[PDB]
Amino acid sequence: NETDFPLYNNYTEPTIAPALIAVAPIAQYLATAIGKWAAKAAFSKVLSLIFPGSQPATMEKVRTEVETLINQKLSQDRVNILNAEYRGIIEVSDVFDAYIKQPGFTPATAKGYFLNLSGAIIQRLPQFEVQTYEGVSIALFTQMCTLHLTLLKDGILAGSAWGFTQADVDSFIKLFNQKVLDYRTRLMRMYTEEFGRLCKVSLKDGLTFRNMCNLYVFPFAEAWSLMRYEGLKLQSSLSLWDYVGVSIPVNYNEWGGLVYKLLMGEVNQRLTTVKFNYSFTNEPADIPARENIRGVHPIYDPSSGLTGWIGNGRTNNFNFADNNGNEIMEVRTQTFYQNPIAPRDIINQILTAPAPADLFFKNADINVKFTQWFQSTLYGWNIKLGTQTVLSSRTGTIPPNYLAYDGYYIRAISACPRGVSLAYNHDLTTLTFNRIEYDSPTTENIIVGFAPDNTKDFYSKKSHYLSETNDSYVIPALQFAEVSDRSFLEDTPDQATDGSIKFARTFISNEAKYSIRLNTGFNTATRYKLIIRVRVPYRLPAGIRVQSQNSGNNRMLGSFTANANPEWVDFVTDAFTFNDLGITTSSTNALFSISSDSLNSGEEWYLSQLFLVKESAFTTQINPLLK
Amino acid sequence: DIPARENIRGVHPIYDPSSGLTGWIGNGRTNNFNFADNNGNEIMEVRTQTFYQNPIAPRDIINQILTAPAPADLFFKNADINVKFTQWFQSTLYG
């Protein structure tokens, strides 16, 4: 026997919980420090968390976890090299951190140690950028840059205390504004290289690599992108994708132009129904039984009809599917023979699974069993969603495959077209208006997306409810109320979200609205500010406009000049109060709108997320305009 | 709305089992998949059951070959054969 044992998210032994990985305390302290930064003290905590007790043991734990996840191990020589680099960094950081804590230390000595540490980090960084092993080192790299980006940050805050002149502080601000972009570019380079390479052989391997990066890489990139401020909230909304089925090669231009769009579906709607096209046949005698998954159809909004079949919903060749007012549910043909008795069955049915009473599935059990027969691969399938057994295999017992993650819930169920070209309808597959479907004879795969629990409230109330206790709120762009036409979904995982909106409408206007509600006890007199993250490659003469619409009490909050820049930019509005907007605890049609005029042919612009933070809690510490 | 119906498609009498002179009067075909004598066996019955769903009445389509051998006393003495007609929109259905 090869393996009769159960599986856990396709792995032979249970995986570590997403909140119990080795980089979790680092991320937690980073999120804590983003809200309130303890000057000349945060670098010490980051050093104690990355190198506990001046030991590289936590980094080795991270390396082992990543190697276990992505099925790529390193050689002992590379391990020794990385450990030597760790030891050098640890020596220099020990010198610096020890000299800091002496009451009455010399500022010039601290300046020298700071310069030595920054130089050593910059010098040893390229050791983690060898592409031949990047798929692993991209994790370790992510930590090192952090240790650097923290250091410089602290150096900018503690000015003359560490022996820095004003020119030194300005040079450090310039170096920080340069490195916060260079490190992100290099990280994205490694990620895109390895992701495309792994997708060109099988979509499952690329999905696994992406799931690893969503936990060990991208949250820290977002943290970097939020370190220049003080008061915003560090929150990730990336999803984990479980793939069960055969291997399908996918190009990188085909991932962001079709496959990801088919996986996401209605990006702001809750899954309400899922349908499968099941086929079973044991026609001959020497040829064993077999099963096929012909198509998957997810139904989110029952009144929109945007999502279509991924695969096919056909059940016969008699062109009878919607006639007589009913829907064909199952077609079974039983054949009997006679030789001087073994009835054969051919079944083609449509399995339907509606959403549970609690609106969402918590876990699943989906598995496929392969069988070789004269260089021909036959399949058997087992499907169970939550507590409803959807399909038990007729070809024999199949071991389970527990698909679950503590702190996540099932939000989307889709598939990938198998045996067809994935290069068509790229420019047609938009967010709305168009039909989201793709014809294919079979799929033979099921893809389940788990979303974190911080998104469970939006997909249940269709709005964003504000509380008084919290100080900062992050709103992803994909969690909108309505969006304009000719809008696309752009996978931007470095933003710690499931994607961004690409506006490319050449008529009327490009507008995106978000629904806001207020809980009881909310203080309507407290001052707030809005921060909008956008990317405007082409110049827009009318700029970007942030507006508040409340039952006709439309008020203009901000008008920002849209200049050409290929990098992400944050627009900050002036202060305001919820009494100026006319919003109370009973307002149900309150909306925030981000709008711009029509574009030209070949032009587009990107919207990432929104930040709502109180005025007292928000402060810019490192100016971005000083390059 | 269209009621049930039955059809007699062919009759095949077999006298001398080793001569093979008599053939089908009508047709012995049971499907359009060209499968009748493959795999060494003879197709005896093909049943298709269709299920629908409207916000349950399974339909059946049966095509089989009924076989009756000669009795122990070599000959049949009597029989009971009958057909029932039914009109439906100028269409005659049979049982």
Next chain:
Amino acid sequence: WNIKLGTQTVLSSRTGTIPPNYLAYDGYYIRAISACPRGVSLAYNHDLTTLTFNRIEYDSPTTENIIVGFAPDNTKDFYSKKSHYLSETNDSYVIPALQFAEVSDRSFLEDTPDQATDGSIKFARTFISNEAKYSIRLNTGFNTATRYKLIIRVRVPYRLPAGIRVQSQNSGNNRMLGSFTANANPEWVDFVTDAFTFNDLGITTSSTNALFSISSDSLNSGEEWYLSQLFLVKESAFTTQINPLLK
């Protein structure tokens, strides 16, 4: 069957010669070509067939029919430029509701031929808001200082606490033109806005994203309201002669 569209022979009959059937009307042009489902029940997907978002189709084995719609020539400019161009010489402008730039979801088409149009918009959205926008452009020589007024024809059977709102949106220069109390009345009503000028709206001869918006809040289950058409007339040329409130 014999089919010919304009000058392109689409299908000549193989079963023999068929006499012609000249489909033409002086002053009209072909705008829509459709058919009717034959041999199937026509009672399904009524609540699903909306103006947008949904798929506009119906499965049927055959149709055996072709239906051609001729529209008058006064609509030829809109279906060619996707906007309404305003001139200085004319004093009054009528804009049907179906000639919009964009419309909200859960909106239906209501055949109201007594309004001398091809139909009216029925809003029945129970979330966000019900909004309808119309694109306006100005020809050269248009006087931007002349005063104008807006008249909105609506039918509001159920009470709307927030009422109806007419607004002018021009590249962010959004200005509120009118806020009208929506009381329950099963008959058609005209709301007249206050006077305004195109300089107050910031619209010139080069504005390409100028829009007029008619909006209202979300409705309740089983509620809807109808919009028929819009009237743009100069202030000097408009006068109410028979008061409608004196019943």
Next chain:
Amino acid sequence: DIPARENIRGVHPIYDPSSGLTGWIGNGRTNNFNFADNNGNEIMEVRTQT
């Protein structure tokens, strides 16, 4: 991408035209519409152009 192909499906030799002893070796079927001897004629060729 799949090149052209040809198949020999059946051979039928006819010796004595009035005996009918020899039959098809293979198959004489040409379609799945069960039309071969209807209308008094014999189906000679079925061509489908796509």
